[PDB]
Structure 1
Amino acid sequence: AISIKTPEDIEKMRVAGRLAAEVLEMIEPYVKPGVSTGELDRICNDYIVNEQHAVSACLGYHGYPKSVCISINEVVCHGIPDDAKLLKDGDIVNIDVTVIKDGFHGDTSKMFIVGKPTIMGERLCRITQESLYLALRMVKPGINLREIGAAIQKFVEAEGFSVVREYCGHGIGQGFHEEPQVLHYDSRETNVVLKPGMTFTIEPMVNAGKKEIRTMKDGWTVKTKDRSLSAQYEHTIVVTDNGCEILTLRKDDTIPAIISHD
């Protein structure tokens, strides 16, 4: 079943979600042409462990060897930090962080555009963030997840892009990936009504081309089948009595942390 978090659990998820957001805030000035993805991962890991006094949920998870996932251009998700892989002008890069603090998880990702942006990279990243935000604005008690996944898909396809169908958002708490699955597209299979105290992620992945993806031979890296660009943003939220509260908000977000309906 889906766990309802207690008020004390929610306070612990505020703290873990803030730490995760803070990793994304911190790492920004380091993202520039010529830096390696391995070095970015080391900086993040060292900050989580030594500064935040927390740990990466990603390190060792099902054997994963690094602390964050770093996904460039046509890599959709789960890109593996590599000391040999250097960023360059125009690259779009997702950094996905999940921190554990006091046994609670905070999970968030954002795109960075490296150096001189390309038109396509700027547009894809903006539409992706807007897809997340439109979903965030819908969350409240009594709505069905289906409606949220439908709204993301409608908006994205109207902008000429496609929604990746795997790798959905998820419940989160003391576990990293809990129920429910949070699909970012319309499915007749989806039927989950929200209630206050649920905690879950929304994390749409949007491809500039077609939706299909492929897992590479390293067993982790996922790429677009068509080699088009792919972008993603993620937040962790808690459902409140009248809306939701974003637990991984950053200073650069332009949506309020607390979304109230009435």
Structure 2
Amino acid sequence: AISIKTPEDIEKMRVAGRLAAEVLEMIEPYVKPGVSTGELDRICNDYIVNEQHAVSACLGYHGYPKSVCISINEVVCHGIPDDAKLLKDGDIVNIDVTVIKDGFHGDTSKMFIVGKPTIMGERLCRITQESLYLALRMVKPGINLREIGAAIQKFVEAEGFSVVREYCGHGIGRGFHEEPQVLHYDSRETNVVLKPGMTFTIEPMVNAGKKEIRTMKDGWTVKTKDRSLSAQYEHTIVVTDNGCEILTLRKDDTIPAIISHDE
């Protein structure tokens, strides 16, 4: 039950994906020691609504109270922007943006290293991004999603890191989360052969320590059980006749938007 997007639908997803990437490009100069995550979220929401003329997909979703998710250090995902939570030197911070424009969603996230980097935070982020890139290079018609999950997990584990099991990438379109599930690890339950026109995300969450996670009493914030650092990067893509096209590419990405496997 995976929708195949029309050329028209794909163009709408290009528009929405560009907007989502542009929020991440816009916010970058504000991501500095001393800024609050609450302030970052307000800046993002104002940009999305007032400049992009779009809406945040997260706001109100299952009751989520903010417009973006901002996850620092051992927070794995779903970190809630807060006026009292200040960024500081050495922090690694995920900002995850999902916008709806003209009925279609764009979904992307990246890590920011705040101020003076720690070497371990830098390495975790780099390996996490590399694991996303490796997976993007695999996407083409006929490949199984299982092969991609397996490859992400092998790469990450060889570095002494772990992949979070509880969360996955997803189909995306008129809905935020559509079929298929995109596991970032090997499972016998995964059997999805890719076809041109499918649109989905890849979004591995990678912990420096052990894979186990925990939800806080606020009902939202997820942390590593061992309090190790965690990192995530996310792109939305469309499968093409010969590979894929990344819909949420930024200028700071170092992988081509259009990946072709033809001669």
**Short-chain TM bin:** over 0.9
Aligned-residue sequence identity (percent) comes to 100
Structure 2's unaligned 5+ residue stretches are none
Q: 1:115-164 CA deviation, whole Å, 9 max, x = no partner?
A: 00001000000000000000000000000000000000000000110000
Distance 2:177 2:60 in 1: 15
Distance 1:221 1:203 in 2: 17
Distance 2:167 2:66 in 1: 19
Q: Which residue of 2 aligns with 1:149?
A: 149
Alpha-carbon offset, residue 59 of structure 1: 0.5
Q: 1:76-106 CA deviation, whole Å, 9 max, x = no partner?
A: 0000000000000000000000010001000
Partner secondary structure for residue 131 of structure 1 = helix
Alpha-carbon offset, residue 215 of structure 1: 1.0
Total equivalences in the alignment = 262
Structure 1's unaligned 5+ residue stretches are none
Partner secondary structure for residue 39 of structure 2 = helix
Distance 1:219 1:104 in 2: 28
What TM-score does the superposition give when structure 1 sets the normalisation length?
1.00
Partner secondary structure for residue 188 of structure 1 = coil
Distance 1:65 1:99 in 2: 15
Distance 1:125 1:23 in 2: 20
Distance 1:250 1:237 in 2: 13
Distance 1:237 1:217 in 2: 34
Alpha-carbon offset, residue 193 of structure 1: 0.4
Question: Runs in 1 of length 4+ with deviation above 6 angstroms?
Answer: none
Alpha-carbon offset, residue 177 of structure 1: 0.3
Distance 1:49 1:248 in 2: 19
Distance 1:160 1:93 in 2: 21
Q: 1:210-247 CA deviation, whole Å, 9 max, x = no partner?
A: 00001111111100000000000000000000000000
Partner secondary structure for residue 115 of structure 1 = coil
Q: Which residue of 1 aligns with 2:60?
A: 60
What TM-score does the superposition give when structure 2 sets the normalisation length?
0.99
Q: Which residue of 1 aligns with 2:205?
A: 205
Distance 1:238 1:113 in 2: 29
Alpha-carbon offset, residue 24 of structure 1: 0.2
Q: 1:171-211 CA deviation, whole Å, 9 max, x = no partner?
A: 00000000000000011111100000000000000000000
Partner secondary structure for residue 156 of structure 1 = helix
Distance 2:216 2:2 in 1: 32
Alpha-carbon offset, residue 258 of structure 1: 0.2
Alpha-carbon offset, residue 167 of structure 1: 1.2
Distance 1:70 1:249 in 2: 19
User: 2:18 aligned with 1:18, yes or no?
Assistant: yes
Partner secondary structure for residue 238 of structure 1 = strand
Alpha-carbon offset, residue 166 of structure 1: 1.2
Q: 1:2-31 CA deviation, whole Å, 9 max, x = no partner?
A: 111000000000000000000000000000
Distance 1:220 1:3 in 2: 30
Distance 2:252 2:231 in 1: 17
